[model samples]
Target chain A: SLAKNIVFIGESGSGKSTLARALAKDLDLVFLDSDFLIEQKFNQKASEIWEQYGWNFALEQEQKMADFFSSCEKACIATSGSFVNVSNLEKAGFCIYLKADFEYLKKRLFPLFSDEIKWKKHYNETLSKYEQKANFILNIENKNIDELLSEIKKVIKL
Target chain B: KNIVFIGESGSGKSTLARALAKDLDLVFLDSDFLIEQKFNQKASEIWEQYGWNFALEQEQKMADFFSSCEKACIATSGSFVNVSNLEKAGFCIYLKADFEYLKKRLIKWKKHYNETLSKYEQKANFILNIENKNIDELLSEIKKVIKLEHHHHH
Candidate 1:
């Protein structure tokens, strides 16, 4: 009875957005970035809200986004890294966890911040959190977008 | 009122947080540094040793702990932007700067410049562009914003 909204969850460098876009096009579904939705609603950035309010408030916003998206039919969602914290979102659609190795992620992350330690700590934490909530785990370290998309379609029977 | 600083790394979040805390006579707390002290190791080392789940848990714990305090200035980690509950507790300021400038100031890591910038640009209570500004000027801008916000709130 579900509308089959595809939800992509993974760490920052895990290609959730990249895959979500392609999936939406292939599936001919409406595409959404939950983070953008949050920003649009509050007239602010999702990260700005997180920095100003705290996790509790941030989760509340994510929950709201989840609730809205869940109500939609045949949509694709590219969620935030911390979207795992919102259980409501996890239940909204078919969830895919894009998993990548530390080295692979690190290679992608090396140019963004000087604090390798912080990045690693955050990445590890995000992966583990999303791991539990994902309905399908897609190992994406060496996989191209086409291959990953095929696997997702196969698993979800889309 | 508590002031939370958010921005990309090397964007002067820490420096501004510490200075603002002192200027406003508020207690100062750095989320990542505090986590390091608590675990008695660098945050990266904690991740390397205990694994990311443990490290992330510690971050959540630290955020919880820090958010509970009242009237304190908090300097958050860049990754702190991801926590869902932390932002609403304070008057958050985003120290926006050019990526090139940030690169000159700090290490270059893979960042969601567009995403992060877009979030802060739209959401931060006060967005201060610090590309060519000095600390004193940044402090002044923050003071001005806080004064207006505090006045409005009270």
Candidate 2:
């Protein structure tokens, strides 16, 4: 029953959304996007929400996602980076923290959308501290999507 | 209902569910039997052949079984709770009894030395640490909690 619900949490460009979708697809779970919810709530996408409401408003929207998560029983979840940092996961469903090496994640995100050289540089760190907090932590190095999905399936017993 | 039965190898845990199946009016299933049946190999052989990942996979299968089952009493292996998929069984009930009772049963079984007995005993210690109570006290606590749940909800 709990395996029917899974939440993917990670920082920007870490492939949380991609991997969450892949796992959901493999498991035939209903995928729920927190970003879509935010867009509907304020008539803006996450980036637009940030521009209009600033960081605080953006965070307010994020907190709502946590609440939506609390009552959810059997859906796959995708959120913007910084989801895990928002609340306690003790009562939360199965949480999968996808950690891609900094440079690998950077290449995946900014490569097509923006100039990798021009975008703001962030000194990212591996979330080893939160590893214990996760039901499963997937380290995506050389592993392909299928490998990751199978590993997740094994962890969640899908 | 998510129920977890915790006891050393010889404490009737392995046979209790099967024997009590008709009385409890529940489908009694052992995670260990499922693993061996699916893989067509004993757990020791599986561990030797496929390593920990294989063992974890077997556990995941059991977790999925428990997730899918309704109103069944599952007799899980000593290592079941450590499994990641088992986290979904949030309503876990840890079955506990005196170690001496367990030891006596285990000695009676005496089928084999059960070389892994120490490892399982260590697992019991870990479970005790999490609940922060001795075996008998933990059983009493579990019974109290079960009664409270049934009294309020049932």
Candidate 3:
């Protein structure tokens, strides 16, 4: 029998999408990106949605994504930091909180909005919430994409 | 024959063997851990400290210590390829995987890979290809073969 879904959550700049997508291909499961779905809903870039409508509205879109997520099977999902419904995710899959240090995150995120300490604090807070709720917290500080996906696959046991 | 697991160093032998033992209520013994307890050193240490030959010798010694053990699921060192007394381990399963597949796992074991694999091939009673296979599937396969081997013996 096939394994259950694998839901990856993390703040922006983490390797959630790359690792989750690779895991999907390696395990031959469907790859679902809730952030993509949210962006599609607004017909705008994800940052534009929250920047224009506020993060509160963006979070509501994440809720909608979670609702859609409930019906998925045998898929690997990568979601935004706002996707905090661990109970909702655990119902269908394992929740892995992809974590990286603030310094490394800045390296990935600096080119974009690149908030200094504020961006750092915001990132920290989002990860903190998910870490407490997630089934597993994986630190992606030094691991490359292949190595990260390998570790993730072992944990998912797919 | 006793039950034992033999495979490449990086293959997930110890955990899978331990899992099978737990599921079937059998005693589990990892030769790596056995040596660690005996010499107060990790497997990597023993191999690096004394060289590959000594580590393998210790693995044999550990296996010999467990020679009289009954129904214990034993996991041999990845380098324990000298299978002269292989018959005693009644159901030795070679945890086989692709070189690249295991390379990533060990990305750990870098010894003479091909030669060691062939040596294990000669020693193992059953070759279990477990590249990226999940726990439940491997367990079912292990159980299925054990029954078949027992059936053949009688």
Candidate 3: residue B138 Cα off by (Å): 0.7
Question: What ranking of all candidate models by lDDT puts the best one first?
Answer: 1, 3, 2
TM-score, structure 1 vs. true: 0.47
True contacts kept of each: 0.00, 0.00, 0.00
DockQ of each: 0.02, 0.01, 0.01
Candidate 2 per-residue lDDT, tens place, A1-158, comes to 54446888766666666676666555644455666545433444668768876687567556646655654455567766656556665344787877766677657755554554444343233365347557788887778888988898888765
| Model 1 stretches with alpha carbons more than 4 Å out | A1-158
Each model's lDDT: 0.72, 0.57, 0.69
Best by lDDT: 1
TM-score of each candidate structure, all chains considered together = 0.47, 0.44, 0.45
Looking at model 2, how many pairs of residues clash? 0
Tens digit of lDDT per residue, candidate 1, span A77-140?
7888667767666667788889888789767764567677787787777777777777888999
Tell me how many clashing residue pairs each candidate has: 32, 0, 3
Q: Candidate 3, residue B16: CA error in Å? A: 1.1
Ten-residue region with minimum lDDT total, candidate 1 chain B: B61-70
